[PDB]
Amino acid sequence: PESADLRALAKHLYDSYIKSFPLTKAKARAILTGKTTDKSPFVIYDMNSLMMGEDKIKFEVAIRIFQGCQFRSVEAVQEITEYAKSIPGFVNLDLNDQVTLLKYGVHEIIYTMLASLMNKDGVLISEGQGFMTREFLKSLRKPFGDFMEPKFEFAVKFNALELDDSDLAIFIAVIILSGDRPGLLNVKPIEDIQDNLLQALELQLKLNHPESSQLFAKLLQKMTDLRQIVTEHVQLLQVIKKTETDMSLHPLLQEIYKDL
Amino acid sequence: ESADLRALAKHLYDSYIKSFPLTKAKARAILTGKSPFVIYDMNSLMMGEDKIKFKHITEVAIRIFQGCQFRSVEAVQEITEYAKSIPGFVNLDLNDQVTLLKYGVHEIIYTMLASLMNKDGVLISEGQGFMTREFLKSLRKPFGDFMEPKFEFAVKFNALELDDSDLAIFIAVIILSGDRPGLLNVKPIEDIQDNLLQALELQLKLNHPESSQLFAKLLQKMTDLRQIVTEHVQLLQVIKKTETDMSLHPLLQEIYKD
Numbered sequence A: 001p002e003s004a005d006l007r008a009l010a011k012h013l014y015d016s017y018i019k020s021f022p023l024t025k026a027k028a029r030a031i032l033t034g035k036t037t038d039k040s041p042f043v044i045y046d047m048n049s050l051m052m053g054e055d056k057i058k059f060e061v062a063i064r065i066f067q068g069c070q071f072r073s074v075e076a077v078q079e080i081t082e083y084a085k086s087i088p089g090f091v092n093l094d095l096n097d098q099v100t101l102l103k104y105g106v107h108e109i110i111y112t113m114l115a116s117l118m119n120k121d122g123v124l125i126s127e128g129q130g131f132m133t134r135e136f137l138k139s140l141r142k143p144f145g146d147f148m149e150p151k152f153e154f155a156v157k158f159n160a161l162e163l164d165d166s167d168l169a170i171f172i173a174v175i176i177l178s179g180d181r182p183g184l185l186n187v188k189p190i191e192d193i194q195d196n197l198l199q200a201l202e203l204q205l206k207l208n209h210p211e212s213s214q215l216f217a218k219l220l221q222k223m224t225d226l227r228q229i230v231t232e233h234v235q236l237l238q239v240i241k242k243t244e245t246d247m248s249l250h251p252l253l254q255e256i257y258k259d260l
Numbered sequence B: 001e002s003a004d005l006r007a008l009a010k011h012l013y014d015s016y017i018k019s020f021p022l023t024k025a026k027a028r029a030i031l032t033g034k035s036p037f038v039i040y041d042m043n044s045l046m047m048g049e050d051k052i053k054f055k056h057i058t059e060v061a062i063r064i065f066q067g068c069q070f071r072s073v074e075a076v077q078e079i080t081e082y083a084k085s086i087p088g089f090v091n092l093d094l095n096d097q098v099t100l101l102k103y104g105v106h107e108i109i110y111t112m113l114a115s116l117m118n119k120d121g122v123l124i125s126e127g128q129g130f131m132t133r134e135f136l137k138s139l140r141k142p143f144g145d146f147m148e149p150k151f152e153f154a155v156k157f158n159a160l161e162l163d164d165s166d167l168a169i170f171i172a173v174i175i176l177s178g179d180r181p182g183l184l185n186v187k188p189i190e191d192i193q194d195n196l197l198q199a200l201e202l203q204l205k206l207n208h209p210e211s212s213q214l215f216a217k218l219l220q221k222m223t224d225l226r227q228i229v230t231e232h233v234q235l236l237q238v239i240k241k242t243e244t245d246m247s248l249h250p251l252l253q254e255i256y257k258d
């Protein structure tokens, strides 16, 4: 059928998702649901546990954390780029559009996938070896303590959809191939790819979550919260560049930030 | 067991046809008879960009190099899809799948590039273009040194007169190499390659029965490929002391491995 092609596209993206992202939601949930003994994380909830964490978990304060996010976000950009090239049709696009799709897509994907590593109490860090609590992060001096709470508020609502990795692989593919990004040269080929991806996502959610009514529509409506959080995130960054003139940002990230 | 070798051969040929747009058959038609814009000097290349719409347009030697980056990245995705059709490949360890492609795309890129080359140049852009061998080696160092070893290999490789049905199995043999570093389960890889080698052997005896030991000679070319690729990557390390734009887009840098 035409839907056999949609299933092959879904399988293809899931395969590439596993190869590109080392820490899946399936692994994050096994670590968080306290399943076992070999996978349990060390919990950073204050400065001493944080001090004992660097000893044990292997990776001022608040600025030590902030540059940790920078470095992991840079690694995430790398992983998202590799995944993007696997999306059929992406690498055949105008190279300026490729750059543009990655530039405006990376932050929406980072905090989509970060939700996989969060519960209401905190977030897994450092390949899941560590867990940082929501309270300790909200306790960081301003304005660093303002970074995390919106993500937690989004993650709780996003995670109630109970998507698995196979669902997420298509959803991230849809996000990358967004024809409404500023400065795109040929919007139509991008939209034709997203059309096929949206078709693939719809069949996937309906087959994977048959009792979940209108999950497709509810997933698409999550973009409002996604884009609101990116907007707040970049404003937070601008406050940092002014009060924190003695702290460098990463060039890959600064070029992504340009005109955000 | 001979029917399943031929079944395997036909399956790979069909998959190769679907995965790679410009086949050797059509490339050879364009290079002889039954027409490409030719790029022979600085002026013709500037005209060719206003002619053929290059999707990578954002020094001339660097602009050609960036074009090779763009097309190589496209070919990785074509080769990846072709690898998925090889019986047994997807059932392999996911990390081994990734390792085979990562260390194998370069050998395949220059195997298939031979299809688009003769002693005088190389087809580009689905055949809409053609870049002369003279112009490419006229490029300033070290960019003028990338392609000459490829032409030398290609003139020899093409003298074997392989067709797409031959090359389909040959490329499959290259992907399923058990000697790539970092593999975790070598047994089923070489198990599949030995099965592809039997199919390649029978294919060449049926399709070139007058070509004595063509099978052995094809295998000898695979070591010529290894040398091409080792020399190629060593040259693109020297590049990161020439094409080093201290003000380059990091996202472009992120895209351009492969």
Ligand SMILES: O=S(=O)(Nc1cc(Cl)c(Oc2cnc3ccccc3c2)c(Cl)c1)c1cc(F)c(Br)cc1F
Pocket: A059, A062, A063, A064, A065, A066, A068, A069, A070, A072, A073, A076, A114, A123, A124, A125, A126, A137, A140, A144, A145, A147, A148, A151, A233
């Ligand atoms: O929520 S953020 O908006 N972004 C965010 C980005 C990533 Cl990649 C991230 O993941 C990691 C992973 N490993 C880590 C290892 C060591 C230290 C921190 C890590 C963070 C997390 Cl937990 C948060 C945000 C939280 C803040 F606490 C600070 Br300070 C700034 C900051 F940007």
Ligand SMILES: O=S(=O)(Nc1cc(Cl)c(Oc2cnc3ccccc3c2)c(Cl)c1)c1cc(F)c(Br)cc1F
Pocket: B054, B061, B062, B063, B064, B065, B066, B067, B068, B071, B072, B075, B109, B113, B122, B123, B124, B125, B136, B139, B143, B144, B146, B147, B150, B232
């Ligand atoms: O021979 S190479 O070793 N690699 C190589 C790789 C591919 Cl995919 C290739 O095919 C194309 C196809 N379309 C193109 C369109 C525009 C511009 C270049 C294209 C190259 C070719 Cl002609 C060469 C090599 C040749 C050099 F001229 C330069 Br500068 C560096 C370089 F790596």
